[PDB]
Design a protein around this ligand. Sequence first.
Ligand SMILES: O=C([O-])C(=O)[O-]
Ligand SMILES: O=C([O-])C(=O)[O-]
Ligand SMILES: [Cl-]
Ligand SMILES: [Cl-]
Ligand SMILES: [K+]
Ligand SMILES: [K+]
Ligand SMILES: [Mg+2]
Ligand SMILES: [Mg+2]
Lengths: 522, 519
Amino acid sequence: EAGTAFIQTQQLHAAMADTFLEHMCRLDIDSPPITARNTGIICTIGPASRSVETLKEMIKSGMNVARLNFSHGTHEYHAETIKNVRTATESFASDPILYRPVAVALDTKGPEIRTGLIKGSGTAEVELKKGATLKITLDNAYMEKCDENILWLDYKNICKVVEVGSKIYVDDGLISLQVKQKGADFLVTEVENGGSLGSKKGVNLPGAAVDLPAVSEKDIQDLKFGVEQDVDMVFASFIRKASDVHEVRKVLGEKGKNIKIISKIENHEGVRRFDEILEASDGIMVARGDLGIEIPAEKVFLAQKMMIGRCNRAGKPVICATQMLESMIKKPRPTRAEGSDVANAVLDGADCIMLSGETAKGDYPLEAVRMQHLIAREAEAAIYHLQLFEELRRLAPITSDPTEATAVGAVEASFKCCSGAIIVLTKSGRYAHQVARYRPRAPIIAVTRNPQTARQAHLYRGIFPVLCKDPVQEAWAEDVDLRVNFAMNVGKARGFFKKGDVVIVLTGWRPFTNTMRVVPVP
Amino acid sequence: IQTQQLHAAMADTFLEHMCRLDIDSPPITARNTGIICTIGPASRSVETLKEMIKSGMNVARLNFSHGTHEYHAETIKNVRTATESFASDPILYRPVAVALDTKGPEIRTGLIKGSGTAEVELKKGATLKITLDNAYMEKCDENILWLDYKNICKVVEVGSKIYVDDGLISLQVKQKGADFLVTEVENGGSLGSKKGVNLPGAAVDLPAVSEKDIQDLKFGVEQDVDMVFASFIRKASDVHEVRKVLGEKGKNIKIISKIENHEGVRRFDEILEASDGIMVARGDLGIEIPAEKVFLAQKMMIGRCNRAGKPVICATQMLESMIKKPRPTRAEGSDVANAVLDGADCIMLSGETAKGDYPLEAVRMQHLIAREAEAAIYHLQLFEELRRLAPITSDPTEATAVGAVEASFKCCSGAIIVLTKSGRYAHQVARYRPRAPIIAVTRNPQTARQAHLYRGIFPVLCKDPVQEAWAEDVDLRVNFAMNVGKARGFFKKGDVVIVLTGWRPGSGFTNTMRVVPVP
Ligand SMILES: O=C([O-])C(=O)[O-]
Ligand SMILES: O=C([O-])C(=O)[O-]
Ligand SMILES: [Cl-]
Ligand SMILES: [Cl-]
Ligand SMILES: [K+]
Ligand SMILES: [K+]
Ligand SMILES: [Mg+2]
Ligand SMILES: [Mg+2]
């Protein structure tokens, strides 16, 4: 009864524009998005978020992956976090239609440089003043006696790799020092950017050739523990070259061969060697914290868009990470730059977005998850699929692989009929990954019986994994129908589609494969 | 490898354009995006303003939500002293514009009672009375909060939500009185003095231009400001009211309408038509509408301003953490770059330069990011779309401008030089978004200041007398631009520049294009 005043939902007016400029001009704050949110949300778990009750609310608010940051905490601490994640996740298991799988990710310490403890108890801070002198020492006598005159750090070969004039950054790149003099085991620096210095802060040496191993002996111990704990993926810090990826993957053994290896790109060499790293990895994280200290801050967006583009071209997941909603560590609403950053990561093409301190340590973890969910849904509708899908196709090789032809045909069909979903029956995730790389607007409901697939599949934009718990039926056709009906019930229960809407169904492995059907929802 | 992201520039698709972006491809010297800096205690001294100018400030914004006319007059004096300290060399002098940002129909709280803690704690679930009784205007606390919107009780009802201090505190109306509201704190926090208030669910009925705004606008005319940033513009008639106040004496002052609420977004097209330009005023906007929708409104407004060829400013919290820290967050670096990639003519700093501890670092960081992002634009697609969407006309000047922009891409020119009295001829080039800087030579000091609002325009103020012969006077001004560009490192011998000049004496056509090897 409203009539012509109707505003198309999900930015469909902008979707139909014939140019990108007109697409922008048509973006409409009064055009509401769809229910389904395609971009996975990865949340770092820490003191603010590791209780079972908070984790339950995190899941309800949209967390898909729990990140364990092995830069901090001992193995028993991480074991208990994992236990709590699983308790919270399985509290929803009694209803498979509504159960959301939750993945567990181990983020390695890797070749970090860290300072020691401020003298006293270690919880104090000292003020470093601009122009003051500060001695960096490797003498362990001072490892718990750091102050404004002497700073211990843990990188034993630092004096080899820095020179007079080089810059040393401490604590998220906020404190900056210039090396004035060298010693056998010390550096004399001048404070450039001063500030308040606490304990065990991260140190960066931009332009220095740091020779620490990508995977140290202690990192291997963490990785082995990750295998014992049945983690789903590793986020490997400071990957510089393809062989670093192999050091991570091969040490997991046969037992860990299905764990996904995500290389974190956070230094200049990782950017330069990106193509070989991408080839060796299952996916990528744009680890912007270190990256924006190792390279000039003003260049990070170039590296981010380069890596997202190349991952989209390769069909491998890419995560945008770090400081996306940073002010929400302390405030209940984000800044305008933070809102923009989340939206633009999605528009760039990121498969997942991440929260670090906002969920690990901040005062508003649930609000931060909820805000990522809200922004991602709005941005997903604003993507200019007309151009994106054309470019992904043109840049995608002709092959004889019938499964790739099925996937692109399904995504094409999904756009042609504005489908409510692409339902995909998948054991390993592969068939669903193949659809996701063509970036449909419609959500991809990936039905699997493999619990690890259900967890890992969150890494791909658009995949909404659901875990079927029904026994396998002896008749293949009956077993397919059971899994398809499960997906239909999920989409109806979750509000993705209604009876009578059109959906695409890919029925998976058949003992041709992965037949496509375009059907009304029963 | 190739500088200026030229490898990415040659990609045949946007996706491959992204794939080719190269942190090791260094940008050109020239920075096309104007930087607008709010002046306040951190940045008001002549000494600091000189460094602000050296660091890249193009426009000084004065926020008339605070301060007296005496205070603002002294700020303007200091801006001018700093600007003219560089005037001894017309070739290395940068014009600096002055912008007056109105108070507008703002709602603010009163002063916290000064005998206790400077801020009071509003706790979730507590009662808080909102009063309009001026007896409490300087006695605000956790029990009673005065605000200055005298008609608030008429536009809210039981259940209405009230937001305070960048939308961080929220209250719900529980009961109404003659001159008060009983509220319950929904989202608590620490409350200081004179904080902004938003009523997103209410039809706020304050005037577009209050008596105070009239006084401030007339002061701006008297002070010879270059532009007004008009707060809370909701409709074309609001723009008309501002323009009427500026009047004949202020007729050449640019009116930039600030879009800060839902109605301004809804009525954007009529606002844009009457305005000279637009500010995406994201602070209020992201309280008035859901924070997750701001990027839609930002990209809509930038796109439409680009289609119209009118300047658009991205504003507010772009580098917010630099109020307290010497480096920005990763989201902040991203936000500045994406504003440029979106198409914003200018970017802005508020607390980062007005009140913070690192004003110069904030200006320098906007300069660095803008230059990198300008090189990363996909000009191939942008220029094609701007051409395709432009209004149809046989105007010789427009045709010459488009031809000059295409020529500039074809030879990767060091600059497009254009002569202009009032700005328009340079604006016409800028709207097609060349990669090459547009060196706009003028003898009009106000044009030189205002032209900063347009992406790519590098204004230069020629101070030489007019030459007797028209052709010799044109040549003098072109040669001035050549020497400025050479001295500033924009180009050198062996480069190629595009030169746009007028037809002949007595014509207003800028219809002559020369493609000039740089001597
Ligand atoms: O390690 C990280 O996640 C980073 O540095 O951004
Ligand atoms: O007024 C402003 O600049 C704002 O609200 O962003
Ligand atoms: Cl996903
Ligand atoms: Cl400019
Ligand atoms: K880590
Ligand atoms: K104002
Ligand atoms: Mg890191
Ligand atoms: Mg405002």
